[PDB]
């Protein structure tokens, strides 16, 4: 039912590994009508300056991948910590 | 497999509402030890900034939910344009 269950749906993962995990979704539903580009890397920048402040991660660690549906675009960002 | 395919789960919605929405998860996995919260609502609060300079829309039409999974917290961001 909830999206974090959708997350959640493959069984227990358990086993601790003793590290933190975020899961970002960053979707942005539009249409083919469109224009001026740069929202979700826009986001992605001042995420990043937040986690530079709080959250010692690099890029190395931090999956960056974009999906592109119809007129609408989704930026996951998976953060290890 | 992507997590937008298990946002868009639910057949086909179609119908043109010529309406932009926003999808936007918020997801801390930690862990039962924990302290010093106030992580959701910052970077919330951050997007409402934001929100408030590019995208006109009010609290009456964003819906704020977070939701508590053991020691995860995940906080979901709905935003009708």
Do not use: C, H, W
Not at 22 to 37: C, D, M, Y
């Amino acid at each position: 039912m909830s999206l974090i269950e959708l997350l959640f749906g493959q069984m227990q993962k358990t086993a601790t590994v003793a590290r933190d995990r975020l899961q970002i979704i960053i979707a942005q539903e539009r249409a083919q009508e469109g224009q001026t580009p740069d929202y979700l890397p826009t986001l992605r920048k001042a995420l990043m300056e937040v986690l530079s402040k709080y959250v010692n991660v690099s890029l190395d660690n931090i999956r960056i991948s974009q999906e592109k549906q119809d007129g609408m675009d989704v930026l996951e960002l998976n953060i290890t910590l």
